[PDB]
Design a protein around this ligand. Structure first.
Ligand SMILES: CNc1cc(Nc2cccn(-c3ccc(C#N)cc3)c2=O)nn2c(C(=O)NC3CC3)cnc12
Length: 251
């Protein structure tokens, strides 16, 4: 990854929070986003650098760009500013008015980005609607949506059990104690089908953990065109999950 000097960046409005981060709009001497890591232990900073490294070594139409990292107790990932923000937020605002054909384009674009990652034997590890950014809305007639899958933030391996429980239903059950992205992908399809209302999201940490410990399965989507696909992706057996080559073909 590229090293960014603090003199080259300007920090503007707070956009929201990530895991152990604060996301701000900014300027790079370009409009960008600044992912400000909380004061952290070296294991966390390392997991943050590993993400910036992974995202700086990849290039795909549906993957967000990483400009670099600015490093005292402050670690800032300088990443792509995407026009319309998170998919989950947009789906809730547009609830009941999002056509099936629009959802199918998003699913295909997401499967495309994940197939590219799969071919290179790389793991994203944080696939959810929140990390899917809308570059184009595709609301006007003769237009379609355009997504950018955001960087996964602090790597999954560096997070606490409490943080992994907070990631349910997107977290693969084998991660509770490349196949994990197939589950993340399936849970994201359900979330898209239910207009940004993910299953179990409202439930308590104890309830979410019990759901996985008791091996319960996630609901079927309201969209029948994705029922088989989500059932195949959301199996507790990682080896039984289809490849993104198969998913992309089946879409
Ligand atoms: C216009 N452009 C952008 C806006 C934006 N906003 C938010 C960031 C974080 C949380 N929330 C949020 C959710 C829910 C609530 C509530 N309630 C409040 C804030 C956002 O809205 N994030 N973002 C990124 C990006 O990489 N963000 C990382 C998440 C991946 C890139 N461009 C943009």
């Amino acid at each position: 990854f590229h090293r960014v000097d603090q003199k080259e960046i300007t920090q503007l409005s707070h956009l929201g929070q990530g895991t152990r981060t604060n996301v701000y709009e900014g300027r790079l001497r370009l409009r960008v986003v600044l992912k400000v890591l909380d004061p952290s232990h070296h294991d966390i900073a390392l997991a943050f650098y590993e993400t910036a490294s992974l995202m700086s070594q990849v290039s795909h139409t549906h993957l967000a760009f990483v400009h670099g990292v600015c490093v005292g107790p402050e670690n800032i990932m300088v990443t792509e500013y995407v026009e319309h923000g998170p998919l989950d937020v947009w789906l809730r605002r547009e609830r009941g008015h999002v056509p099936m054909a629009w959802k199918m384009v998003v699913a295909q674009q997401l499967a495309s980005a994940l197939s590219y990652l799969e071919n290179k034997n790389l793991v994203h590890g944080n696939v959810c609607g929140r990390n899917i950014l809308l570059a184009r809305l595709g609301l006007a007639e003769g237009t379609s949506p355009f997504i950018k899958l955001s960087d996964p933030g602090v790597g999954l391996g560096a997070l606490s059990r409490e943080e992994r429980v907070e990631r349910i239903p997107w977290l693969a059950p084998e991660c509770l104690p490349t196949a994990m992205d197939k589950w993340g992908f399936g849970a994201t399809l359900l979330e898209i089908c239910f207009d940004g209302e993910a299953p179990l999201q409202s439930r308590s940490p104890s309830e979410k953990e019990h759901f996985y410990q008791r091996q319960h399965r996630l609901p079927e989507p309201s969209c029948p065109q994705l029922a088989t696909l989500t059932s195949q992706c959301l199996t507790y057996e990682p080896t039984q999950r289809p490849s993104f080559r198969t998913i992309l073909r089946d879409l």
